[PDB]
Amino acid sequence: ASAWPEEKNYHQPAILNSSALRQIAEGTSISEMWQNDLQPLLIERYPGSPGSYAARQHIMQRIQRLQADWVLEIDTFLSQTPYGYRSFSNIISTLNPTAKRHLVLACHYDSKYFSHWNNRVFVGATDGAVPCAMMLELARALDKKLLSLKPDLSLQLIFFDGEEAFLHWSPQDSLYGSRHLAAKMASTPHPPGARGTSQLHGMDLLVLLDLIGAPNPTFPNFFPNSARWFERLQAIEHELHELGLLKDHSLEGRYFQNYSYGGVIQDDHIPFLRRGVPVLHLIPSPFPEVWHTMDDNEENLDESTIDNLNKILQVFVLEYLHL
Numbered sequence: 001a002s003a004w005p006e007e008k009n010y011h012q013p014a015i016l017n018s019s020a021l022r023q024i025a026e027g028t029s030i031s032e033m034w035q036n037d038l039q040p041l042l043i044e045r046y047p048g049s050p051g052s053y054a055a056r057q058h059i060m061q062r063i064q065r066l067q068a069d070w071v072l073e074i075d076t077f078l079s080q081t082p083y084g085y086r087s088f089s090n091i092i093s094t095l096n097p098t099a100k101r102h103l104v105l106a107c108h109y110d111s112k113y114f115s116h117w118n119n120r121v122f123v124g125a126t127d128g129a130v131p132c133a134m135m136l137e138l139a140r141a142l143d144k145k146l147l148s149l150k151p152d153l154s155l156q157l158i159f160f161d162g163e164e165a166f167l168h169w170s171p172q173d174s175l176y177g178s179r180h181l182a183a184k185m186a187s188t189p190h191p192p193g194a195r196g197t198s199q200l201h202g203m204d205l206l207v208l209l210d211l212i213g214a215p216n217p218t219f220p221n222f223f224p225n226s227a228r229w230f231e232r233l234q235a236i237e238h239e240l241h242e243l244g245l246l247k248d249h250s251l252e253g254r255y256f257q258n259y260s261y262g263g264v265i266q267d268d269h270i271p272f273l274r275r276g277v278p279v280l281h282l283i284p285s286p287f288p289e290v291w292h293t294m295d296d297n298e299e300n301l302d303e304s305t306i307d308n309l310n311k312i313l314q315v316f317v318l319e320y321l322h323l
C-alpha cells in the first residue's frame, strides 16, 4: 500500500537565491495584469449571468494562449438555490493531470448578485476579480518555467463558481461550486486506476486567495497543519523586502503577520478543509472596508500591494514546485 499521500507532510521547498528572486520580481508585470487579466473581469458576473459566461471565456482564453500544457475542464452542475434550481460552472486548469500530487491555487470568479442600485453595479474587484487576475498573471509570468513540467508533483488552478450566497450567507446558500467540487474530487480515484486514493489525497495544499486588493492587508496564520507554509510566505516577504524588491512596503506593515485566528471564516476552502485537505487561506482579517459594497471597485484597489503579493505568491509556487 503506497504511502505517497503522506509525501506532502515532508515536502520541503527548494529556496530561491537573491539572483533568482530578483528575476521573479522583474518577470511579473502589474500593468500587463491590470490591462489584460483584471479589467476584463471587472463586470457583473453572478451565476447564470451573461457576465459569468464572459468571465469564464476570458479565463480559459488567457490560459489557452500560454505555452505550458494546461488542461482545462469546466465542471458544470445543478444545485438548488433560494431562486430555484440553477446551473454553475467551476473552471479547473491542470498541469500534468495524471500527476499524483498537485499544489492547488484557487479563487472564485463569480461576483455576488445585487440588483443595480442608483446606477451602480457590483463588480467585487477584491472579491474575487483581483485573486483571479493574480492566478492568471502567475500562469503567464512563470509560463516558461512551468513548461518544463511537461516528486510526481505539479500545479492546478481552480476558479470556483457560486462562492457567494444569493441572499446572505447560510449553510445551503453559498459555496455552491466548492461544496460540489470537493465532494466530486473526494469520490474520484486518483491517479487514474487507483484502488483507494482520491483526487483529494492528491491535493498537497490548497492555497485560496480572496478579498485581495485593498491597502494594508493582514493575513493571519489560520491552521496548524499549514503553518510551516505560512512561515515560508513570511520568509519570502521578508527577503523580497530586504532585497528592495517590493514597493511602498515596510516590515512593520508586513502582510503576513505572526498571529492566529480562533474563529472560522466561510469561504471556498471549507468543503476541502472539512474533508482533510491542508489549506493556506490567503484572505485578510479584517476584511477590506469596501467588502460587499458598490465601492469594491477598481478605483479602491492598491496597485503596489497587489504587485508585491504577485511576487510573493510566484516565489512561493516556484519554491514549492522546485522550479
Ligand SMILES: [Zn+2]
Binding pocket: 112, 124, 127, 164, 292
Ligand atoms: Zn464576497
